Amino acid sequence: SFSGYLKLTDNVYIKNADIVEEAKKVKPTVVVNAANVYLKHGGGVAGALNKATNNAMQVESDDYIATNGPLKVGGSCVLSGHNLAKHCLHVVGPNVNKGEDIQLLKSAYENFNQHEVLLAPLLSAGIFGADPIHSLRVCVDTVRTNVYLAVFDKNLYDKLVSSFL
Ligand SMILES: CC(=O)Nc1nccs1
DSSP states (O other): OOOSOEEOSSSEEEEEOOHHHHHHHHOOSEEEEEOOTTOOOOSHHHHHHHHHTTTHHHHHHHHHHHHHOOOOTTOEEEEEOTTTOSEEEEEOOOOGGGTOOTTHHHHHHHGGGGSSEEEEOOTTOGGGOSOHHHHHHHHHHHOOSEEEEEEOOHHHHHHHHHHOO
């Protein structure tokens, strides 16, 4: 199972780790992707997860979008986890760099409550432009299921742990 995580609350855990390396190691039931509404996995966590699947995640995503249309900001879809997990929960957090409503971050984290345990990144953090300290706060105040957060950046991980209320 998950190892080396620091417990933040009854159900939220955090580790300074590469989510791709963490997923390849643990092979969780659910890995969360920091997706956009188009499921175009170009950069950040999405680009890294997609590259680990040898682009199979993008091929599957394009078929999903061709059939269903784009997701909503704050929404999600369950697709295959390929070589990383049983499933990938593609969750769309608001992209602050696109002027998307940050109040949608709580709606995005609510998607995690449909899964008993997840390996996940901080939603809307990184290239999505939101404050990662705010994202962690929304995570612990919204998610009731067991979430194992992988924070790639060591300096951000230390800042998140040392500032956690
Ligand atoms: C390679 C890479 O970006 N990994 C990440 N893990 C958690 C957040 S970003």
